[PDB]
Write an enzyme that holds these catalytic residues in place. Structure first.
Site, short mmCIF file in Angstrom:
data_model
loop_
_atom_site.label_atom_id
_atom_site.label_comp_id
_atom_site.label_asym_id
_atom_site.label_seq_id
_atom_site.Cartn_x
_atom_site.Cartn_y
_atom_site.Cartn_z
N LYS D 28 39.50 39.64 44.72
CA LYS D 28 40.10 38.63 43.86
C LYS D 28 40.06 37.27 44.60
O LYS D 28 39.63 37.21 45.76
CB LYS D 28 41.51 39.03 43.38
CG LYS D 28 42.56 39.07 44.50
CD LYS D 28 43.92 39.42 43.95
CE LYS D 28 44.96 39.35 45.04
NZ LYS D 28 46.26 39.90 44.58
N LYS D 86 38.87 44.29 36.39
CA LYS D 86 40.27 43.99 36.09
C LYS D 86 40.42 42.67 35.37
O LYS D 86 39.93 41.65 35.84
CB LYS D 86 41.07 43.97 37.41
CG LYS D 86 42.57 44.05 37.24
CD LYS D 86 43.31 43.86 38.58
CE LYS D 86 42.87 44.77 39.71
NZ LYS D 86 43.65 44.52 40.95
#
EC number: 4.2.3.153
Lengths: 228, 228, 228, 228, 228, 228
Positions: D28, D86
């Protein structure tokens, strides 16, 4: 006796307003707001066409709370030939901000000519734009040393001064301004029907354009003048 | 050669800036914003104290998109003794709005005196305030008939011109302004260290206050002048 | 010579655009904005139906300032069969943000194939949506290593590219893009009447849908192609 | 048994997380938000360094409601080597918008590889950012055909998952996700102390970084893995 | 069996609703919002005209997150004769805020009369107004100790409950409310066509006005009652 | 003679205020705003602990413009034991909205007990929160048939009533309220030093908490009472 103020869109309309018997020739710019400011060259052209015995009014805008800018703008309007300098109390939110701005405008104008007149104008429909409460304009004008307390409408959607303010509240506004030694000017899509009501409450100056139109017609200005 | 512009907070600081060798004495009002306008009486007092061989600059504000108001304010600043009239392009959102406002200011100022200088000022950090893109300032100044293209910082949180704009982009800005026959002024919490960089890229005018300090010290102004 | 880009709503409209002589078949999704992104399966279906000698373009959206998201989306569009990957510079507020996002998109696309083309698209009416100034699009494209500088309209209310940008400013935009070695694409409710003007100023690519219609008619595409 | 997910900031931290016994290496970009998307080259580099027997997860962002853009971004992440894709349900406001976006992401990912896993992630503190209600994420994941229902914190101010959600409400969330055949992942400034609580409620995956740090220490990852 | 709730605009409409077979006479004020509160004197007049074997419902508003104000308002509605006290969960943003406000309303009402019923009402179109997610209303009602979980529409633009919520999601909402020992009321521009659908899913109370009109007609209420 | 109003945080602080000589025991809830409403059970507990010869005041909130909700809340406060029902004119923007809301509150309260007192409270710092102009509160109270015109501060940042309003303007406010047959209450981080000033201008009621502290001390209340 009520004084008739007419806001012509151009020099040609000014001549018509003059011929019809208008007492004050008001220079504003609707594209920039209710009391939007016109240009120095337009104020000068209007003062040049207006006979000596009549007064010229000019707005400096639906102003933000910028005392320096507005004081300089009031100088520009005064230098350009405006006898009445009108400030639209738009971006000022309360009594203190409005007094601070207006005190500086008053100093600026009087420094150009002590005979020039300063107008503090509030909006009858202030709530629609977040402007300072119109009912405190007489105290703002008193405390800033202004000469005239005025109301106009902010949004030009056809809703009049009388759609936002009751006759009783307006009569109280006029009485309060008079009690402080001020003159009171009222406008806001005024129609011929509103003239006797405004005269009755003791209004000193009435502002029109639409009631005189469609372009300004000297015959209709004459009719409005007779009603005053 | 770079011209040194200093923005004093009062008449006493102006004397300090003059004594230290400042070339332009800039009159602004930080309380009203980055390029907040001061009052007509302050511009007049500053021009009175400033030697005739030096120029006085005055801002008209971090302006909203109100051409009439700002044109009148430019008249007020010019009449008050400003040789340079600076407009902060704050409320204007794009090229067209900025050109329209600046064309009207240019007329208002050039009508008074063709020798008075009009500065179109954009903010290096415009994105923090929603102001017009600073990199189009040279084209706005070219197309409005301005004399100077300028950048300053909108928010005075200690972040400098160099924190928002790279040396390369600033060098391009200066070259572009020069290609259109304009002069270029740069400011934005400028520090002594920034002076050789600004000189190197061909900047015509550098604006300061903080670097000359908390009060303006003539010794510090002298130091900055030597670096220019 | 001007290249004709057509944006069909479905596979059937793509066949119509191809049959009519469109040079680029552009895949966008108006439901998600001006340059709203369509789905990977739609880009793939359009590339399958499009003759190998014609190029397929696909938008990644009216993008927020999210370099990672947009770089991944550019990969998705490229993998799906897009030859041109178009980024709508919507949420980016200034030159630096736009360059940072576009540099990452350029890497994502050029890493897959150096022959794939990256289009940096600004909005002619950016001020209506708060997007990056359209006039700096050629510098953003130059500095990010993009291949094409483009303008389109953000709000589809019938107002065209020419309602927001003058012919002169557009001619400057095209010349500047060409000076940096870029191609220039122009769109924004383009009408047949606009085609000779765009050709005249040296525009490389013209984008349409409405002018070819309500559905894409091959006869109308042919008419537009003849005008190019 | 709880699976340990670790989010390393770089390739070096990934090696540390791997050595310590992390089961999922999550990619991320905190600069772009809670579930900010990293770049295709970073996901690829992480999949390259991660042993075959471990899975790589990657976020596509704290996404706006742009199904096309996010579907393309999910393709970019999948192509780059992400096994788990995600989506941060940030700009989606309700059940319907979230299901529409997630259905398209699910189609996009499965079209790349049916073995890849799609994660619908809501924010435990959604009210602080205007995001979709976290308690409906299990139904969104069920109805969109996702594989994992997840919660994380949107604002990284040190406030944990447990500061926004009670143990009872979280136990209900986990039970509901399990009743729909989904796995449940929980994160949000998780500390070692929170691990037995999360294990007790039946959480399938726990996400950490801080609890493993300051940089990731394989000894601390090992300690967390033993607690799982 | 479904109970028929009718919201009359006046005492005369209440009599029509009663004569037609309405089971609950609901007192609201559309001028103040979807579930805008009427005045104490109106609730009292409606409780008086309504036969003692029928129940009176009254809303306390599309409430902001002000537990104290709303608890006092619930006392006012209860004292005025309301048997059902309905709270529109408008300004509450999440589960916790909604439970806190509702727990206080429940205490306030129970302290007046244990037999009075508390309705926690959410909006099927909450996303249009920023209100709490409608799908968590059954848990809010369970955890606050409310008696009824309800959905209505916030914006009265003709879009119905079925335009915002699927039959499956509504069936899940009803089942969940029943599983917590609550009754479920559904409204939102309900039409006669919607009645068999609502009955089928096990809805306890259906709320109408427009479906009974134009003014409320007893014949139309009778028709709706037969459908229930 | 000035009446001393004290706002205790709990029943124990109320006893101290009573023992020290406070005349009015005011029940508010700072968590919900300046004039945030407390709960019915708290107003009831305070009315019980307060000797029958002293009055209890209770706020209904920093109210939005919701006449029905606020009228019901005023009933709740009155039923709970409040002798003075105070309305914080927060969400009302102008004279008309404020008179409409207050007229309904006055009717609601009078229908419970003719002897109960209605306070129309404005904010001295209204501009900070967008509330109705404080200087028109005496006319709002007159025209709505309220018994008391009050000012307090909206934001509790340590800035007092005297930081927002001049002694002259406050003296005018008091005189105007008295001219309409109203009582005047003034509060806003009042300090012991402010008491002789408030007494001098003819203020009927002074509101305190901090000046009596840190918790309320009977010795300090006695000192304030002696100053009144």
């Amino acid at each position: 006796h009520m004084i008739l103020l007419v806001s012509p869109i151009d020099v040609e309309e000014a001549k018509e307003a003059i011929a019809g018997g208008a007492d004050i020739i008001d220079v504003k710019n609707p594209k920039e707001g209710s009391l939007g400011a016109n240009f120095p060259w337009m104020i000068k052209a209007i003062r040049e066409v207006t006979p000596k015995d009549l007064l010229v009014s000019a707005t400096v805008g639906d102003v933000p709370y910028k005392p320096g800018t507005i004081s300089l703008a009031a100088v520009g309007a005064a230098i350009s030939g405006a006898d009445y300098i009108k400030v639209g109390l738009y971006g000022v939110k309360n009594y203190y901000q409005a007094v601070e701005l207006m005190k500086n405008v008053v100093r600026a104008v009087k420094d150009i000519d002590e005979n020039k007149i300063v107008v503090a104008a509030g909006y009858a429909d202030a709530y629609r734009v977040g402007a300072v409460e119109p009912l405190i304009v007489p105290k703002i004008a008193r405390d800033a040393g202004c000469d005239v307390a005025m109301l106009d409408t902010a949004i030009k959607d056809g809703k009049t001064l009388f759609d936002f303010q009751s006759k009783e509240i307006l009569a109280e506004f006029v009485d309060e301004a008079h009690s402080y030694g001020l003159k009171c000017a009222l406008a806001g899509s005024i129609k011929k029907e509103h003239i006797p009501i405004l005269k009755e409450i003791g209004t000193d100056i009435v502002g029109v354009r639409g009631a005189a139109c469609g372009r300004i017609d000297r015959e209709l200005v004459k009719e409005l003048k007779e009603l005053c």
